[PDB]
Amino acid sequence: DLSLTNSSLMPTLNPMIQQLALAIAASWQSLPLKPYQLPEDLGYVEGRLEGEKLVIENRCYQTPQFRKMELELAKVGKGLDILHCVMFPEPLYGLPLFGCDIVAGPGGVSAAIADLSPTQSDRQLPAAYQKSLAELGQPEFEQQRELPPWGEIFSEYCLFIRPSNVTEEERFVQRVVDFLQIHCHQSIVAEPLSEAQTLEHRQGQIHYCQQQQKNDKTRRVLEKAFGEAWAERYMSQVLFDVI
Numbered sequence: 001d002l003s004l005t006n007s008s009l010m011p012t013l014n015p016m017i018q019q020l021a022l023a024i025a026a027s028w029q030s031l032p033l034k035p036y037q038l039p040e041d042l043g044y045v046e047g048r049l050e051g052e053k054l055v056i057e058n059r060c061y062q063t064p065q066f067r068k069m070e071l072e073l074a075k076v077g078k079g080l081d082i083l084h085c086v087m088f089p090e091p092l093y094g095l096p097l098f099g100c101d102i103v104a105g106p107g108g109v110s111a112a113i114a115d116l117s118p119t120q121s122d123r124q125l126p127a128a129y130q131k132s133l134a135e136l137g138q139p140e141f142e143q144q145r146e147l148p149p150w151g152e153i154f155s156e157y158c159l160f161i162r163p164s165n166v167t168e169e170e171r172f173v174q175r176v177v178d179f180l181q182i183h184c185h186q187s188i189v190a191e192p193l194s195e196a197q198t199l200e201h202r203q204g205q206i207h208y209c210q211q212q213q214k215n216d217k218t219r220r221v222l223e224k225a226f227g228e229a230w231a232e233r234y235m236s237q238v239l240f241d242v243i
């Protein structure tokens with residue numbers, strides 16, 4: 001569950017990943033949660049082929065506004081730590097997609113990504129999100145990274161950095177907390193949309209998932225531990241299921 005107290009991975013993960021996992025779990029803890037059953041009720045898996053072992057822990061929930069909320073922690077061998085999180089919105093409410101991805105090695109966090117990603121056909125966040133996000137101001141980060149082409153799905157507020165130091169790690173985590181606070185609040189003030197609008201939002205979410213599946217960074221890690229067929233099933237059915 002979300003206490004993370006029973007996590008075998010948590011104690012061994014990069015400190016920024018630990019703080020983000022805690023912040024996400026704390027954001028969700030008091031929501032009207034129900035468990036979301038993943039395919040094969042996956043909650044914990046390990047695999048190895050010729051190289052290092054991959055270990056994954058999944059914690060997945062749903063609420064009336066979020067069809068599926070995944071907080072996944074993973075580790076390859078002793079080096080490589082990963083946090084994956086997506087809140088998949090229920091299209092009826094028209095909320096954007098919260099996501100973040102953190103990858104860390106022995107030399108520190110290599111990649112930190114977070115976004116509230118659009119589902120509207122115009123590729124814009126809803127007005128209230130645009131207002132609340134603009135009010136946060138532009139955060140300063142020394143080592144910005146350019147998104148790959150499939151990353152067109154991310155909003156203009158997307159963060160993609162290599163944190164330079166602890167101050168930046170903490171600034172990034174605080175901005176994710178700010179995104180979550182906005183998202184939670186908007187989830188209370190959102191109404192059921194029209195059938196045509198619900199359809200538009202569903203289409204945006206489907207596109208997001210199809211584009212995320214183009215990420216070979218994820219795919220290679222999965223393939224090196226479990227092989228091609230397993231990785232394809234995991235990406236298309238567990239991580240980024242097309243609704």
Ligand SMILES: C=CC1=C(C)/C(=C/c2[nH]c(/C=C3N=C(/C=C4\NC(=O)C(C)=C4C=C)C(C)=C\3CCC(=O)O)c(CCC(=O)O)c2C)NC1=O
Pocket residue numbers: 074082083084085086098099100101103110111113114115147148151160215217218219221222
């Ligand atoms: C088993 C799960 C899982 C694995 C194995 C994983 C691996 C992974 N993701 C990466 C990058 C990345 N990850 C993302 C983004 C995301 N990825 C997401 O899963 C989500 C929800 C977003 C955004 C909200 C982007 C944009 C990159 C950079 C891709 C690139 O450089 O080509 C990288 C490269 C890190 C680096 O270049 O420093 C690895 C190894 N991420 C995972 O989540």
Ligand SMILES: [Cl-]
Pocket residue numbers: 148149150151214
């Ligand atoms: Cl691409």
Ligand SMILES: [Cl-]
Pocket residue numbers: none
């Ligand atoms: Cl390699």
